Each structure stands twice: as C-alpha cells, then as structure tokens.
Ligand binder design. Structure first.
Ligand SMILES: CCCCCCCCCCCCCC(=O)SCCNC(=O)CCNC(=O)[C@H](O)C(C)(C)COP(=O)(O)OP(=O)(O)OC[C@H]1O[C@@H](n2cnc3c(N)ncnc32)[C@H](O)[C@@H]1OP(=O)(O)O
Lengths: 340, 338
C-alpha cells in the first residue's frame, strides 16, 4: 500500500475566476513615483516575477462567499445535492473571523444536515491537498459517502493597503522590497466533491502521496489580511532544496519517473521559481500549465483551480497520471497523484 | 468503527500568570454602570466568572502553544524526533500564513518528515484535531502526534474595556460585547500514540459529531473584539448539546450513571447548570474552572482533562466523556477510557 488511498475518487470539481482584472501596468502607474525615487528602472512585476495581471472580487465578497460559489458549482459537477455531504472542510488562507470557522459559514449558506462534520484547515498554499487527505481517510474507511473541500481567497485588502503603504512619501526601500510579493497574489476559488469509488466507478482516483517539511524557515513569508512580508530570494533557494527531498520520497512511495507522468499541477509563486523547479527535476514544460501570468498566486486554491482548468480545457484523458505538487510557506512540500 | 488502537501518551496545560478579577473590572466599568443605571454585577453574580488569567506582554499564541507542547512531550517521555504529526487547534493565531503549527514546530525542532497544519473550529477544534490525528495513527502513517493550543485574550480585554469606558457607549453595545469579558488565556497540548507503543496509557475511542451551522452568526471573534448574542446562543447551544448527547447514548452506549467524569466546554454558570439538569448529571462529576479562568476556548476541555490528570484523581477504567462545543454551531462528544 505504502499508505496510498484505496477507493477514493474525485466526483466533482470546479473553480471560480474573480471578475475584475487588475493589470501590472495599472499597478506600475501608481508605483512609478516610488520606483523613480528608489531608482528602480526594471519592471519587477511584469518582467522579473512574470505577472501581467491578477483578478479581484468586489469589496463585499468574503472568503465564505467565494467558497460557497465554488461549492455550489462543484455539487452540480458531481450531480449531487448538499444532503449527501457528510464532511465539509474549508482550506483557505483568507478567513471571515478567528471564530467561527469559515467552514461553518459556508455550511450554513449551503444548508448541510445536522450530521455534517465541518471545520477549517489552514496551512498556507498546501492546505487544499491536506484537506483532500483528511477527507480521503474518512472516505476510504467508509465513515461518509461524500465530502466537500472548499477554498475562496480574497486579496482585495492586501492590494488596497500595500499600494497605499508603498506609495507613501516615507516608504523605505526595505519595506518596499519586503512587501513587493504581495502584488503577485490573486483572488479566486475552488471546490471538490470527493466520494467512495463504489459510488462513482468512472471518476478519477486520488491516491494521495508524500509530504516533507523545513519548519526552521517559518519566518520567510508572513501574511495577514492587509499585509504580506516575504524573503523571495530565500524562499526560492530553500523551497527548491525541500522539493528535492520530497521528490526522492515521491519516487519511493509513488514510483514516480517524470517522463511517465502526463501532467504536473504545480503551485506557483513566480515565473522564475517555476522555471527553477522544472529545470531541477527535468520536467517537460509542455506538461506544466500556468495561470500565474494572468491570475497571479491564488494561495491554496491554485492547485485545484489549475486542475479544474485542465479538466475544462479537455487536456485530461482517462488513465492520465497527474502529479499535484507544491511548496507552501512553513516551509512544507507535498506531492500527490490522481489517476484520471 | 470506533478507534481501536489510539492512546493518549502525554498531556499538559499552562495557566496564564496574571489574574484580572471581575471586582477589578467592575471598578473600571463603574462610572459606565452609574450612567445607564446598571445595578447588577452580571459577571460575578450571573455568569459566575470571578476572575480570568492574562499573559505577559506580547506572548503569542505560538509561544503559549510551544510552552504546553514541551511539557506534554515530557509527560509522554518522548523527544520531539518521534512526532510525525503536529496540529495546532487554537482560535488565537499569529498570522493567516504560515500555520501557527509551523511556528510551534520550528520552535520545537520537529524533523523534516513531520507533517504540520492548523485546524480552526472555534472551541471544538481540539477534539477535531484529536480525531484527525487518531485516523492517521490507526492507519499506520505515524506513531506519535502532538495536538497543541494556546489562547490569548490580552488584546480583546484591552480593546473591549476601552470601548466600554468610552463616554459614548450605549447599553446595547455593552451587552453584545459582555461575553468577551468571560474569555481567558491558557494553553494545552496532548501527545497521542499507537496503543502498542504505550500499553498503560488511556485509550481514546472517538465519538459522534453533530452540527447546527444555521447559527454561525451568533458569536463572532477576532483578536481585538468579540460580539455575541448571549441569550440565543445559550438556548441553541444547549439544544445541539442535547441532540449530540442523544446520539452519543446510541453509538457509544452511554448512560449517565455509567460515566465517571464529564469534561465539558467551560462557558458559564448558567450554561453549565442548564446542560447538567437536562440529563440529571451529578455536578460533582463536572470539574469547572471558568470561575477563576473564564472561557479558554478550544483549550478548555484538554486543560480540564490535564488538571484532572495532575490531581491524581482518576483510576484505571474510569470512563471519561469529552463534551466539546463551539460557535458554528458544532458539537462533538467522545470517550476516553483511563
Ligand atoms: C457539550 C458542551 C456543554 C457546554 C455547556 C453549554 C454550552 C452552550 C453554549 C454554546 C456556545 C458555543 C461556544 C461558546 O462558548 S461562544 C461564547 C459564549 N459564551 C457566553 O455567552 C458567556 C457570557 N454569557 C453568559 O454567561 C450568560 O449568557 C449571561 C450571564 C450573560 C446571561 O445569563 P442568564 O441566563 O442568567 O441571563 P438572564 O437574562 O436570565 O439575566 C438577566 C440579568 O443578567 C443581565 N444580563 C444578561 N445578559 C447580559 C449581557 N449579554 N450583558 C449584560 N448584562 C446581561 C440582565 O441585564 C439582567 O440583569 P438584572 O435585570 O436582573 O439587572
């Protein structure tokens, strides 16, 4: 077994693209006076990070609202009603309150039954995969028939407040550099219905995978509702080191050889980080979908949004082996397999 | 069915160092009380919370949690290198990213194999964390798990007492922030293990979970503010608690006279009284610390369990019912055999 999941399936999947486009060109317009004062002559967003646009919601959209929208769409995709759901996990970085959980708010919106178990999982960009594993352990055992894993991310306030701080006459070069990665974040949402395979014999299978950690690096990227501070240089170097460890494990437990994988669904922090990742493991770039260029980094929703987009694009065929991979602040790294 | 091979290897709590009495709070509120014409001591006489504990300045959730974790490892007689899973279940949190668990894990020096993340579910999350860990242990993924929880209410007291002493405060504003004045600081941590590793240790059997998520608006909390519909929350909270207990009677086979301790969420005197009379539970079998510690959120249940353990009270075979509940509303009831 190697503790891989048996008879756990993806019954439904969906994403929501946030409606309002914010271009790096617009951003650079606002920041230009500060660029000039600091003597920055390069387009650090568009050319260095490789981000050309990102999407935002309306101001009044909460994490629970975006998650609820994705969940209803996924329920339709699995062709089931909310009454079938025995577990709902919300995995987002964004959250409505410290208490109650965002999951309870989403569950109240959807109308789950009084038998439905709900809670949040938080773990930066890897939480959706953590949520899938937790649901999978219940599904494999047969405690429930169907689960929802949900995730809505809102970056509105971080853009609003970061831009104000950075266009201050008094902003220091250090603060500017520290906060710049915030302007690579994006809004979006995703949700997945997982099921016992017996109920959905033709659905994709989720096998799980492996995780490794380097929690001595927990200071590298710190975020709250209106601020994210990031050591981008160190994140890259230490992130890659951690992935290599995780890849050794993936080869032991998953039996992975890169040329035998059909798709790589990778969490994205920037264009150069992704290029370094791919170069490191000899991955065929044709096997790596990216949406960072126009959606930026959607935190823990990124992986399932990309998977959902691949499905919607017709890129996924029966029997395709799909690798889910990411490095999340912590640091953590998880790699898991789906067989379409 | 129930967990078969899961034990509690170690357990610990931290009581916060500074006492804030209700008498001391009331002296501060008094001129607000004299305006508005309030002549009742709600905290002391009605809620029955006479004191709560605060941390030193700038103690973070992660610091409190790390403190409890080091104690719980000592209690379990294991080094951090044996921990394959660390879950942080606190309401309080350092940041949105990364997990507070990664910060505690960094403090402790966990290994590069150790899986970590947060579970958030108001005052229920410790029991949720226990069950998540239990499923991994049963499945052979790990040998030992830490479940940790540090709560800090310092800021909520500072900010709330500011608002309540404002010359503008109205009585309705006062009433819907009053519950914030029943919260308290503290921390707890638990080591869970595969039973073959720790044969004399208490067994955790798991339990049953019910929800009333239509009531998610009734208690809303951030670091600096908690707004609470006290009346409806007490009424619906006990409604769900009553339903989960009925479910527990069915699947765990529970009958009241056959349980030796009830370890319940620590809310208030009337909440407690209302629940205990529903099922004719002996109040002598229900340890309470809110009188002096207030409501410590999801850490309340394991803090009580730890105090019972340290009291040296419990005997082998004692059936201990863990009754958790949290804003949501969510309720979970589970059994430990000592
Ligand atoms: C399974 C788990 C089991 C756990 C146990 C059960 C949990 C269930 C809950 C689940 C939750 C989930 C998780 C959580 O923990 S979420 C947090 C919830 N915690 C709390 O609400 C604790 C704080 N509240 C209380 O202790 C009670 O609700 C109080 C004491 C407030 C009322 O208590 P009681 O029933 O006695 O109300 P009464 O109407 O008969 O008293 C009237 C008198 O008191 C006065 N007054 C009243 N309210 C307020 C106020 N807000 N502001 C100012 N004053 C107030 C009033 O003016 C009057 O004074 P006087 O006219 O006579 O001058």
């Amino acid at each position: 077994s190697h503790m891989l999941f048996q008879n756990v399936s993806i019954a439904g999947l969906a994403h929501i693209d946030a409606p309002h486009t914010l271009t790096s060109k617009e951003i650079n317009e606002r920041l230009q006076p500060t660029y000039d004062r600091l003597g920055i002559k390069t387009d650090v967003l568009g050319d260095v990070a490789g981000i050309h646009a990102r999407r935002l919601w309306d101001q009044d959209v909460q994490a629970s609202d975006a998650a609820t929208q994705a969940a209803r769409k996924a329920l339709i995709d699995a062709n089931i009603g909310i009454e079938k759901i025995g577990l709902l996990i919300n995995t987002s970085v964004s959250r409505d309150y410290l208490e109650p959980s965002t999951a309870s708010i989403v569950s109240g919106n959807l109308g789950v039954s009084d038998h439905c178990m709900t809670f949040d999982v938080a773990n930066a960009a890897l939480a959706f995969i953590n949520g899938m594993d937790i649901a999978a352990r219940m599904l494999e055992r047969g405690e429930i028939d169907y689960a929802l894993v949900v995730d809505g991310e809102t970056a509105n306030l971080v853009y609003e407040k970061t831009l104000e701080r950075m266009t201050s006459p008094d902003v220091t070069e250090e603060e500017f550099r520290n906060e710049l990665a915030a302007l690579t974040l994006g809004c979006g949402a995703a949700a997945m219905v997982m099921a016992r395979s017996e109920l959905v014999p033709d659905a994709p299978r989720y096998k799980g995978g492996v995780t490794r950690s380097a929690t001595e690096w927990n200071k590298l990227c710190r975020g709250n509702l209106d601020r994210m501070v990031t050591d981008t240089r160190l994140l890259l170097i230490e992130g890659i080191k951690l992935a290599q460890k995780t890849f050794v494990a993936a080869k032991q437990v998953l039996g992975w050889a890169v040329e035998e994988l059909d798709q790589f669904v990778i969490h994205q922090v920037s264009r150069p980080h992704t290029a370094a990742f791919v170069k490191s493991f000899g991955i065929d770039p044709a096997k790596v979908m990216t949406i960072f260029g126009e959606h930026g980094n959607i935190g823990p929703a990124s992986v399932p949004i990309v998977l959902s987009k691949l499905k919607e694009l017709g890129r996924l065929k029966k029997g395709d082996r799909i690798a889910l991979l990411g490095i999340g602040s912590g640091l953590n790294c998880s790699m898991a397999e789906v067989v379409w």
